[PDB]
Amino acid sequence: VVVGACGVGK
Amino acid sequence: ALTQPPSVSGSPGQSVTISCTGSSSDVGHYNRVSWYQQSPGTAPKLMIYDVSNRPSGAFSRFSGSRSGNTASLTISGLQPEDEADYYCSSHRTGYTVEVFGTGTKVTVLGQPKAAPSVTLFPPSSEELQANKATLVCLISDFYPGAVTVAWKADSSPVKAGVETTTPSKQSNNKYAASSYLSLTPEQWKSHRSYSCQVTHEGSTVEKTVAPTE
Amino acid sequence: GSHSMRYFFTSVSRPGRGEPRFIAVGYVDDTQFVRFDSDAASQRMEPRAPWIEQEGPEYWDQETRNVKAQSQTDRVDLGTLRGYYNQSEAGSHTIQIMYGCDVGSDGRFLRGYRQDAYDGKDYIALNEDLRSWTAADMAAQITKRKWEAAHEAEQLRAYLDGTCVEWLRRYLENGKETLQRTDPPKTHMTHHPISDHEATLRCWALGFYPAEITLTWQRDGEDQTQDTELVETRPAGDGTFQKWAAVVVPSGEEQRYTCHVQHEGLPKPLTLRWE
Amino acid sequence: IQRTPKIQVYSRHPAENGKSNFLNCYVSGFHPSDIEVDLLKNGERIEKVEHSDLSFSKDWSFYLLYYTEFTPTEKDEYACRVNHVTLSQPKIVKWDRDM
Amino acid sequence: VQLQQSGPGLVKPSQTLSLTCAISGDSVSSNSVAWNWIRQSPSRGLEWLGRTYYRSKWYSDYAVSVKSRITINPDTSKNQFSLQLTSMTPEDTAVYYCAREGVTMGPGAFDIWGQGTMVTVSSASTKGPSVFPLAPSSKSAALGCLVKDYFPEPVTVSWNSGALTSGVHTFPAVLQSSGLYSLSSVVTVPSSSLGTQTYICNVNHKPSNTKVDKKVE
Ligand SMILES: *CCC(=O)N1CCN(c2nc(=O)n(-c3c(C)ccnc3C(C)C)c3nc(-c4c(O)cccc4F)c(F)cc23)[C@@H](C)C1
Structure with missing residues (x-):
């Protein structure tokens, strides 16, 4: 499973 | 801020360069830049969407570029149709807030000293029945826009009763203007005639009306 | 593991x-x-x-x-x-x-x-x-x-x-x-002469999985790593991997060389030589 | 930044003439990911060619496998043609049955 | 794609501005777009106010110059979005534009724009125009009309209910010392047709719901 939590950008 | 030169000018067929400059707070910022043309009386229109990128082949006269904190719009083959106010748009890196440039007016050199066409209306009966009068004087077509207006009642100047607005663009590249003298029906009938006097770059004309017509 | x-x-x-x-x-x-x-x-x-x-x-x-x-x-x-x-x-x-x-x-x-x-x-x-x-x-x-x-x-x-x-x-x-399978290398050796005085020995591993393998050549029981040519491990396309290692041997010294193969599918390191 | 493709041309199974086999062209160690690979038979391009999904190694270099089904015979020769921004001209690697 | 703006042209000082932009031929909750507000005023030029967009959830950005006063609300049932700007002071006097940006061009490349809405901030009461004809006065010909002592600034003037597609000029309104506006328009007509052809000056002052028509003779 791929990570399911949205992340902030660079 | 994202500053611009107040105005630039050129003869038909020349190339003219508009530039807009970031505040030199950091070097990598203002990387994506886009350019807007605004003709008088309507919404801005997109010429360029990233530095040197055009939405379609319709914008072939327009060429975008960048160097350091500076970005530029070059307009080649400048036409009388290209006189407008131009704004760049971009944002700092690490931010989502857009900023616009201050705006540059691009001006096209051209046909000399177009003289004012002039007309004048007397007070109408419908207005006089209201115990009011307005002398309506209109200045239909002129260039380069340096016009002054003055009024005389039986050669007596009027200064307290006069109201005016600044010379402004037509749909054509020429200017137009208007003025009103406010007076009573007693003043309208007491005086023998009224003159609207229009001076354009020293050349002067008068338009005249009287209560006997 | x-x-x-x-x-x-x-x-x-x-x-x-x-x-x-x-x-x-x-x-x-x-x-x-x-x-x-x-x-x-x-x-x-x-x-x-x-x-x-x-x-x-x-x-x-x-x-x-x-x-x-x-x-x-x-x-x-x-x-x-x-x-x-x-x-x-x-x-x-x-x-x-x-x-x-x-x-x-x-x-x-x-x-x-x-x-x-x-x-x-x-x-x-x-x-x-x-x-x-x-x-x-x-x-x-x-x-x-x-x-x-x-x-x-x-x-x-x-x-x-x-x-x-x-x-x-x-x-x-x-x-x-x-x-969770483990497939041992189906090893073999081939001889390819290159001149009147020298020949190449190629030592092969085929059909193995997982892809982690070592191939090495010795002569007289001393390592020949600096004189060995290897291809990097390559997929076969069916879930297995291939590799080989080779040395130039002067004619007549093929019996002095020996190739060692090490992989998880082999109970102990396996040796090959020309015959 | 840029890295030159390493190339290998080989068969899935040991070559026997007249028996079905698969011709592989494995290209690894290139960067950027834009690359064109064609399989050739007697100089002609093979149209029925499949490939793996794009993946990369610990050093950030890419790799791909291009493959097609073929039957070995003594009269035909096979090759892989690779073109990449790091190559001044398309590079041809011929199939050798012993490699 | 069309963007259609609507809302009031006058708001009292310290009241709330509430404008709509309604979308046609595109979907407000589209995952390839964002929906923007921009305003233009002679003391500040173009100023950007904020955006809203959808990906799997709604998101927004607001400019810091208005962040505490502003909010942009979508309506997926009516396929529109609205600007609410609170505590309107005279400095908020501007023409307000809605716009679209997509993902194929980057952020700040405003692809489609709305018809601008002129917003006035004043305590002065609304006043519909006093309308008069201006006689052709045997000149050769042209006709005029005057719309006098009116507030706030937006007025639409046209001739024969839009039947005249050319030869019409509308002058910019004179702001008088009383704070009321006065405006006039003219049309060039043939002198041979003026003799039998009737010309109506049609005045529509939307901010007072005043629609009045004068025959010019
Ligand atoms: C967890 C999900 C999340 O956090 N999200 C916020 C970030 N985001 C996002 N999505 C998006 O489509 N754009 C965008 C827009 C609005 C317009 C045009 N192009 C794009 C993308 C393709 C760049 C985002 N744009 C920015 C951005 C803006 O608006 C302006 C300047 C610089 C930018 F980077 C942004 F910060 C986030 C964008 C989605 C993933 C949901």
Whole structure:
């Protein structure tokens, strides 16, 4: 499973 | 801020360069830049969407570029149709807030000293029945826009009763203007005639009306 | 022994009005099991192994939503890094991401990873303690500070030592017939003369899995590594790997040389010589 | 930044003439990911060619496998043609049965 | 794609501005767009106010110059979005534009724009125009009309209910010392047709719901 939590950008 | 030169000018067929400059707070910022043309009386229109990128082949006269904190719009083959106010748009890196440039007016050199066409209306009966009068004087077509207006009642100047607005663009590249003298029906009938006097770059004309017509 | 899961993501900008190319690939050990690709017609996560197709629509919907969320994040990072490096609008640029976990033979967590790169160079990576980041350059310092203030490590650690381990145990059991195999190398040797005084001996390994193998040549019982030629390990295309190692031997010395093969499918290191 | 593709041309199974086999072209160690690979038979391009999904190594270099089904025979020769931004001209690697 | 703006042209000092932009031929909750507000005023030029967009959830950005006063609300049932700007002071006097940006061009490339809405901030009461004909006065020919002592600034003036597509000029309104506006328009007509052809000056002052028509003779 791929990570399911949205992340902030660079 | 994202500053611009107040105005630039050129003869038909020349190339003219508009530039807009970031505040030199950091070097990598203002990387994506886009350019807007605004003709008088309507919404801005997109010429360029990233530095040197055009939405379609319709914008072939327009060429975008960048160097350091500076970005530029070059307009080649400048036409009388290209006189407008131009704004760049971009944002700092690490931010989502857009900023616009201050705006540059691009001006096209051209046909000399177009003289004012002039007309004048007397007070109408419908207005006089209201115990009011307005002398309506209109200045239909002129260039380069340096016009002054003055009024005389039986050669007596009027200064307290006069109201005016600044010379402004037509749909054509020429200017137009208007003025009103406010007076009573007693003043309208007491005086023998009224003159609207229009001076354009020293050349002067008068338009005249009287209560006997 | 130990087992691992990996996900590999690549995003490439295409200048003008074009969308970035995005590709995602998933592996358990050496075996690929899923993909996604932006330029495919289906726009879904797709199976790439026989043992994963027993997963229901709830798996394939969740996985499809989450690769599209990674895809959408990279589009914004491509535009940001172009600015951090003060680059022009004219060229394509590439982001690559790798993350995953290692689980031991007893099913306990060993370690987890994340690594980022921009145009083939290290950008930022997660440290082995899953608490802090290492920045590669001056543009990566901005990202390091941003990700520390957002506590990004704390969300990622809770996936790496948690959900990554549960689903790895599930895959290893559900594919136990195929993932947990070990196939020994079907070794042989061939002789190829090159001149009137010299010949080449080629020592082969075929049909093995997993891909971790050593091939080495000795002469009189001394190592010949500095005079050995090897190809890098190559896929066969059916789930097995190939490799060979070779030496030039003067004619008549073929009986003095010997090739050693070491792999997990062999009870002890295996020796070959010409005959 | 840029890396030159390494190339190998080989068969899945040991070559026997008249028996079905698969011709592999494995290209690794390149960067950026834009690359074109064609399989050739007697100089002609093979249209029925499949490939692996794009993946990369620990050093951020890419790799791909291109493959097609074929039958070996004494009269035909096979090759892989690779073109990449790091190559000044398309590079041809011929199939050798012993490699 | 069309963007259609609507809302009031006058708001009292310290009251709330509430404008709509309604979308046609495109979907407000589209995952490939964002919906923007921009304003133009002679003391500040173009100023950007904020955006809203959808991906799997709604998101927004607001400019810091108005962040505490502003909010942009979508309506997926009517396929529109609205600007609410509170505590309107005279400095908020501007023409307000809605716009679209997509994902194929980057952020700040405003692809489609709305018809601008002129917003006035004043304590002065609304006053519909006193309308008069201006006689052709045997000149050769042209006709005029005057719309006098009116507030706030937006007025639409046209001839024969839009039947005249050319030869019409409308002058910019004179702001008088009383704070009321006065405006006039003219049309060039043939002198041979003026003798039998009737010309109506049509005045529509939307801010007072005043629609009045004068025959010019
Ligand atoms: C967890 C999900 C999340 O956090 N999200 C916020 C970030 N985001 C996002 N999405 C998006 O489509 N754009 C965008 C827009 C609005 C317009 C045109 N192109 C894009 C993308 C393709 C770049 C985002 N744009 C920015 C951004 C703006 O608006 C302006 C300047 C610089 C920018 F980077 C942004 F910060 C986030 C955008 C989605 C992933 C949800």
